[PDB]
Amino acid sequence: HISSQQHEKAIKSYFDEAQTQGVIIIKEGKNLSTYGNALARANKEYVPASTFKMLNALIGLENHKATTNEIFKWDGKKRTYPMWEKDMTLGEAMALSAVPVYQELARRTGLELMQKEVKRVNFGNTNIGTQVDNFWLVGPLKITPVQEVNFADDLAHNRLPFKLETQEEVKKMLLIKEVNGSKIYAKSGWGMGVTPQVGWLTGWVEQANGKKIPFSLNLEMKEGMSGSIRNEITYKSLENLGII
Numbered sequence: 167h168i169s170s171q172q173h174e175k176a177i178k179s180y181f182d183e184a185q186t187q188g189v190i191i192i193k194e195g196k197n198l199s200t201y202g203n204a205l206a207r208a209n210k211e212y213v214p215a216s217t218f219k220m221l222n223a224l225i226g227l228e229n230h231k232a233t234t235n236e237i238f239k240w241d242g243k244k245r246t247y248p249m250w251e252k253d254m255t256l257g258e259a260m261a262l263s264a265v266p267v268y269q270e271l272a273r274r275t276g277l278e279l280m281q282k283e284v285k286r287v288n289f290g291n292t293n294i295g296t297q298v299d300n301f302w303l304v305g306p307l308k309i310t311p312v313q314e315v316n317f318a319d320d321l322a323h324n325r326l327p328f329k330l331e332t333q334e335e336v337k338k339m340l341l342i343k344e345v346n347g348s349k350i351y352a353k354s355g356w357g358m359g360v361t362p363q364v365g366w367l368t369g370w371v372e373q374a375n376g377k378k379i380p381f382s383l384n385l386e387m388k389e390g391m392s393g394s395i396r397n398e399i400t401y402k403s404l405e406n407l408g409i410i
């Protein structure tokens with residue numbers, strides 16, 4: 167059927183079209199496949215930005231800093247977006263990328279317990295520095311695309327070091343799409359507080375047959391660029407490969 171050359175060329179063109187530089191790592195079993203127009207990005211470290219919420223939620227829930235039904239009330243102070251000026255659960259904050267909610271969860275957890283938990287799960291370079299409420303947005307915490315797909319892979323298969331129920335609670339927060347019998351779980355991310363700006367879309371597809379195929383899209387976000395491009399490129403790549 168389709169040659170590997172054609173698949174690589176098609177996915178590369180998806181990034182070229184967006185006029186940006188990026189990569190998308192696909193994992194099948196133990197095998198990693200790297201596609202895109204800037205393959206060397208696969209092993210380079212970038213702030214995780216919003217993708218860190220996945221782990222933030224895992225930690226908070228596990229260490230009883232919150233429950234999946236707890237409503238984090240908006241304090242009435244102006245937020246970056248109107249959509250964030252409301253009361254929401256962790257899951258809702260997850261789908262809305264409600265950073266203010268996760269900064270509160272981070273503060274509840276505390277620096278010491280956070281550094282110890284990040285270290286314990288071995289996330290990225292595992293360094294969160296001294297500011298417990300922004301280490302995943304402007305550093306020092308960093309992680310590579312390869313590490314992100316492995317994290318997605320682990321969560322998808324419940325291999326992370328947390329109660330089975332905790333991982334399941336968080337996975338439920340990540341369902342972002344259903345395509346032709348396939349379910350797509352993922353967390354987007356956009357580090358605007360760093361230069362250059364990094365974009366993420368890390369998750370996995372759950373196929374009808376039950377097989378889970380993890381992936382991590384990582385690229386450079388440029389102003390005047392839509393966050394939906396990450397989603398378009400990811401879906402087109404997944405589809406081109408016949409994943410969905």
Ligand SMILES: C[C@](COC(N)=O)([C@@H](Nc1c(C=O)cc2cc(C(N)=O)ccn12)C(=O)O)S(=O)O
Pocket residue numbers: 215216217246261262263265303354355356357358393
């Ligand atoms: C593009 C997304 C999601 O956007 C949707 N889905 O609406 C999101 N980005 C993000 C993230 C997570 O990366 C973290 C912040 C922090 C700020 C701040 N001012 O302190 C501003 C935007 N922040 C956004 O700005 O809207 S990202 O894919 O999570």
